Amino acid sequence: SKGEELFTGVVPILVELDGDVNGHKFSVSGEGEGDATYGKLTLKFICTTGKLPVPWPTLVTTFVQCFARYPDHMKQHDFFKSAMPEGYVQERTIFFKDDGNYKTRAEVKFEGDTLVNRIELKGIDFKEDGNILGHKLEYNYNSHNVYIMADKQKNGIKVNFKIRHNIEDGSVQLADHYQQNTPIGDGPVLLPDNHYLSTQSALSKDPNEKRDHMVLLEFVTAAGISQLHQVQCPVCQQMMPAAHINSHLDRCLLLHPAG
Amino acid sequence: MSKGEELFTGVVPILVELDGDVNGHKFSVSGEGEGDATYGKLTLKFICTTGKLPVPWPTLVTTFVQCFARYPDHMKQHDFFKSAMPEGYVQERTIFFKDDGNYKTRAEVKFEGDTLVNRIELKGIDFKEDGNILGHKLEYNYNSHNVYIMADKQKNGIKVNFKIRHNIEDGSVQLADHYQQNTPIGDGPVLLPDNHYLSTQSALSKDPNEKRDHMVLLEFVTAAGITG
Amino acid sequence: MQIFVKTLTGKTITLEVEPSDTIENVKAKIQDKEGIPPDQQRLIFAGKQLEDGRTLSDYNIQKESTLHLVLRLRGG
Numbered sequence A: 001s002k003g004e005e006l007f008t009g010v011v012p013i014l015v016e017l018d019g020d021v022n023g024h025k026f027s028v029s030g031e032g033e034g035d036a037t038y039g040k041l042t043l044k045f046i047c048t049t050g051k052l053p054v055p056w057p058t059l060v061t062t063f064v065q066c067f068a069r070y071p072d073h074m075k076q077h078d079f080f081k082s083a084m085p086e087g088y089v090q091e092r093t094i095f096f097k098d099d100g101n102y103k104t105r106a107e108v109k110f111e112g113d114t115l116v117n118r119i120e121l122k123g124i125d126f127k128e129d130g131n132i133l134g135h136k137l138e139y140n141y142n143s144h145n146v147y148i149m150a151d152k153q154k155n156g157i158k159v160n161f162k163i164r165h166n167i168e169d170g171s172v173q174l175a176d177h178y179q180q181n182t183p184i185g186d187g188p189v190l191l192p193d194n195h196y197l198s199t200q201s202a203l204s205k206d207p208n209e210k211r212d213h214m215v216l217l218e219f220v221t222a223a224g225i226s227q228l229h230q231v232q233c234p235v236c237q238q239m240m241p242a243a244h245i246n247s248h249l250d251r252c253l254l255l256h257p258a259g
Numbered sequence B: 001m002s003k004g005e006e007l008f009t010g011v012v013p014i015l016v017e018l019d020g021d022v023n024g025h026k027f028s029v030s031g032e033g034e035g036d037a038t039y040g041k042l043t044l045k046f047i048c049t050t051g052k053l054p055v056p057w058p059t060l061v062t063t064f065v066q067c068f069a070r071y072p073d074h075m076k077q078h079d080f081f082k083s084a085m086p087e088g089y090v091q092e093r094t095i096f097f098k099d100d101g102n103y104k105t106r107a108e109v110k111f112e113g114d115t116l117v118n119r120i121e122l123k124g125i126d127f128k129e130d131g132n133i134l135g136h137k138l139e140y141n142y143n144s145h146n147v148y149i150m151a152d153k154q155k156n157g158i159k160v161n162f163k164i165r166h167n168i169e170d171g172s173v174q175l176a177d178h179y180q181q182n183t184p185i186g187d188g189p190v191l192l193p194d195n196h197y198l199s200t201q202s203a204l205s206k207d208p209n210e211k212r213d214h215m216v217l218l219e220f221v222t223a224a225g226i227t228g
Numbered sequence C: 001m002q003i004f005v006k007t008l009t010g011k012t013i014t015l016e017v018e019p020s021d022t023i024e025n026v027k028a029k030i031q032d033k034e035g036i037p038p039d040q041q042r043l044i045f046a047g048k049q050l051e052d053g054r055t056l057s058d059y060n061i062q063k064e065s066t067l068h069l070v071l072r073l074r075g076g
C-alpha cells in the first residue's frame, strides 16, 4: 500500500482528548512516537485540567493501530496504514461490565510529519462507588487479542475485543470494546481477512512529573493468518468467541422471539 | 539508605547468562541490555545460542534483576536488592506450572565491574511432551503481576511469592506458581523489608533483523503496598 | 431479486432469489456458490432464524435484505 510507505521509520505522534464522564469534564494531551517496523508505540499523557476523574488504564485503548507490525505475509491485511495519510475515523463503544460505558470518536490522520489522534469521549451511567469512579483499578495492563473483520458495506473494519482491567482487591473488571473504523478519504483501502493484532502494554510514571499523567508503552504485532475470534450475535449484538455462537443462539433466538 | 543504592542512580548495563536443562533438552541463552532504576525500566535482548529454545520464551521471563525496581522515596528502606550490591545476592526459585512440570533455578546477581550480571542455572523435570510448555502452546505475550515480598531474618534476606498468568494458544490460562528466596552474597549489612510488593509489567517482542531464536523484553517494575 | 448473506468471516455473498423460494432452496444456492453443506447453515434475518419449509416472504424478506449466516459444524 501507499499509506504503508509512511511507516518505515519513527513517526512522531500527538494525541488530544476532550472527555466528559458522568458530568466530569476533562482534557488530556499526549505525544511521543510510533515505529511500525518493530510494532512499538511510546507515549506520555498529561491531564491538563488537573486530576483525571477516571483511571488512566480505562483510557489506554482510546489513546493508533496504524503502528502495529504486520508481518510480510499479512501486509495485504493492513487496513490502518492503507487509509493513510487521509486517515480514518475510529469509533468505539466500550462497556464496563456491571457499570457505565464510554463512546469515543476519533480521527487518526497525518498532519505533516506527525500522526495525530483526536478524540471526543462521552461517558455515562457510571457508579459513583464503582471500580471506575472509585478509582479501584490497579495501575497496570495486560495482553489482549484485537480481532479484526472486514466490513465491505462500510468500506472499513469491524473490530472486537475484551480488556481485562485488574482491580486492587484482586478481581478483574472487564471492558467489551466494540469498534469500527472508516476511511476519511475515497482512496482505496485494504479490506482484510479475519485476523488479530497481538497487543501488550506497560504503564509507568515519569518520576520528574508531578502533574497527573501516564507513560504508555505498547507492542503490537498482527497474527492469526477461528473459534477464538470475537463476533457479534446477529440477534442481540453481544460479542463472544466464535466457539460459543451456536449454543448462545439456541438460547438467544428463544429469548427474543420477535427479533 | 544503602551503599548499593548509589550504583543504580543512572543507566546500568546488564548481562544475562543462563544454562538450561528441561526434560533432558539442554540449552544456553545469553542476554544483554540495560536497566534504569530511577524509572523502574528494564530492557533486554536474549539469544538462544544452542539453536531452538526447547521451551517457550515467556516461561523464562521471570528467570531472566529485581534490583532495577523503582522504589519510591518513602520505600527506600525496604530495598533488599540494591542494599546487597555490589557483592550481590543469590536468587532461588521453584516454579510449578499447573498440571505440568516444574523449573528449579539458582542465580547469582551481582556487579562485575560496572555491568549488572545475572548468571542462572535452570533445571526442568516432569514436563508433559504434549503439554503447553514442551508443546509450545503459549502465546508470545505477557501480563502484569504483583510480586509479594517478606523479610527472611534467619537467612538475612527475603521470601517472595507470586503467580504468573501465561496465556495459551487456545484461550485458556496456565498458572506458574513462583516460590523465591533471595540471600546476600556478602557479609555486609543489608536492608530487611517490611511486607510490600513489586508491581510488574512486561511486553515481549522481536528484533525483525535477528535470525536466531530470540526475545526482546521490556519490564517496568515499581515497589508499592506501603502508603505515602 | 438479489439479497446478501453476511458471514462472520467478514464475507458478503450476494444471491439470486424469488420470494417464493423455500429456505432449503436458499441454503442450496448458498452451497452452490460457497460449497457449504445446507445442514451446517443457520440463516438469521432481523433477529429471527429461518426455517426449512417456509419461504423468503413468510419472513417478508425483500430485495437487498441482508441475511446472517452462522455455521454449525455438526448438530445442524
Ligand SMILES: [Zn+2]
Residues within 6 Å of the ligand: A233, A234, A235, A236, A237, A238, A248, A249, A252, A253
Ligand atoms: Zn444473542
